Amino acid sequence: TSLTAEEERFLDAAEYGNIPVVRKMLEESKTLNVNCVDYMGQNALQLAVGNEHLEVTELLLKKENLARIGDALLLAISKGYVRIVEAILNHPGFAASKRLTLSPCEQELQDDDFYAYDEDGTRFSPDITPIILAAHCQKYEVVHMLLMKGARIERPHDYFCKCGDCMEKQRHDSFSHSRSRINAYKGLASPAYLSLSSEDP
Amino acid sequence: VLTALELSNELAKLANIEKEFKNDYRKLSMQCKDFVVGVLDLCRDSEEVEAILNGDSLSRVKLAIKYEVKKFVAHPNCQQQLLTIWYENLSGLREQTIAIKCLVVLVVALGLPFLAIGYWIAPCSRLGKILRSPFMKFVA
Ligand SMILES: [Zn+2]
């Protein structure tokens, strides 16, 4: 591919959890861009998230300019990586932005590849928030942590709602709207979100 | 998906012809149908649903009906498109109850000659679009 030797060494060390090699790579190295991604491969941070490595993921999170954080958060939520989820949520990006609460589809102009998958799409549906995914996987710890940060599953409107937002979504690509409603209800109907959501569940 | 559908047709035909290994060929045809259904299942947008339902006119739906691929046509991802096309140019009637639909049928029956006579101006009229819908054809 278009990859070079140094960045490939970085990627394999991160994927296989070579902590000292990654630490040497990120110290006093002008080259070896942190967010370098193959044409059809995963980011280094995504590789570190896929195979549980808290130290490697946090060392990557040291760097301020680094993308695909949301995709790795979704990947960690899809599994039991509670510590990795906690480390990712500690990034200043989530703290000082509305990324966590709002869905990737309508969070912003989505200029950056925050939730982007390998090349074009997303790991999950564009209307699946991290909290909705956590409810889907019934991860009680992850659901509790996401709720403690202020992220909640917004209740979908009535099926006959005629507001501007609902009409705008229904006018074009109504199947995605129906699938998003079903996903939101599946998140709401999950036992984890039901038990940890509100008083008197 | 088209290759799998034609292969399902071929496997069903060979299951009928052989009659010795009919179970094996039927199992292979079921495998092809399951692959088609699974490919349809992963849709997440209306564009992908349309792309699977017809190539570059529900061509793939018609071709699956011809091959008796029951699960591909009865899948909700295809039913959502078939209902939108079926209730074309009249969307408010979809959510009405069965009694309202029967009332609409009776109203059409009472005034069928009148709307037939007025169909001459229908192409230039607003109501012609309603009368040309795939549902009002069935009601008529
Ligand atoms: Zn609404």
Swiss-Prot record, chain A:
Query: Which residues does the annotation say bind Ca(2+) 1?
Result: 52
Localization annotation: Cell membrane
The record's tissue-specificity note reads: Expressed predominantly in brain and at much lower levels in ovary, colon, small intestine, lung, prostate, placenta and testis.
Q: Which domain of life does the protein's organism represent?
A: Eukaryota
Segments annotated as ANK repeats: 5-34, 40-69, 71-97, 126-155
User: Subunit structure, per the record?
Assistant: Homotetramer. Interacts with ITPR1. Interacts with ITPR3. Interacts with MX1. Interacts with RNF24. Interacts with JPH2; the interaction is involved in maintaining Ca(2+) homeostasis in skeletal muscle and is mediated by JPH2 'Ser-165' phosphorylation.
Q: Which disease is it linked to?
A: Spinocerebellar ataxia 41: A form of spinocerebellar ataxia, a clinically and genetically heterogeneous group of cerebellar disorders. Patients show progressive incoordination of gait and often poor coordination of hands, speech and eye movements, due to degeneration of the cerebellum with variable involvement of the brainstem and spinal cord.
* Domain topic, free-text comment: The cytoplasmic portion of the protein is required for channel assembly and gating.
> Which protein family is named in the record?
Belongs to the transient receptor (TC 1.A.4) family. STrpC subfamily. TRPC3 sub-subfamily.
Tell me the function of this protein. Answer: Forms a receptor-activated non-selective calcium permeant cation channel.
Q: Know the name of this protein?
A: Short transient receptor potential channel 3
In its UniProt entry, the species of origin is given as Homo sapiens
Please state the gene responsible for encoding this protein: TRPC3
* Included range, full protein: 107 to 307 of 921
Swiss-Prot record, chain B:
Q: Which domain of life is it from?
A: Eukaryota
Tell me the tissue specificity: Expressed predominantly in brain and at much lower levels in ovary, colon, small intestine, lung, prostate, placenta and testis.
Compartments, record wording: Cell membrane
Fill in the domain comment: The cytoplasmic portion of the protein is required for channel assembly and gating.
Instruction: Please give the family membership noted in the entry.
Output: Belongs to the transient receptor (TC 1.A.4) family. STrpC subfamily. TRPC3 sub-subfamily.
**Function comment:** Forms a receptor-activated non-selective calcium permeant cation channel.
Record text on subunit structure and interactions: Homotetramer. Interacts with ITPR1. Interacts with ITPR3. Interacts with MX1. Interacts with RNF24. Interacts with JPH2; the interaction is involved in maintaining Ca(2+) homeostasis in skeletal muscle and is mediated by JPH2 'Ser-165' phosphorylation.
Associated pathology = Spinocerebellar ataxia 41: A form of spinocerebellar ataxia, a clinically and genetically heterogeneous group of cerebellar disorders. Patients show progressive incoordination of gait and often poor coordination of hands, speech and eye movements, due to degeneration of the cerebellum with variable involvement of the brainstem and spinal cord.
- Could you identify this protein by its name? Short transient receptor potential channel 3
Q: Which organism is it from?
A: Homo sapiens
Question: What does the organism's lineage look like at the top?
Answer: Eukaryota, Metazoa, Chordata, Craniata, Vertebrata
Give the gene name: TRPC3
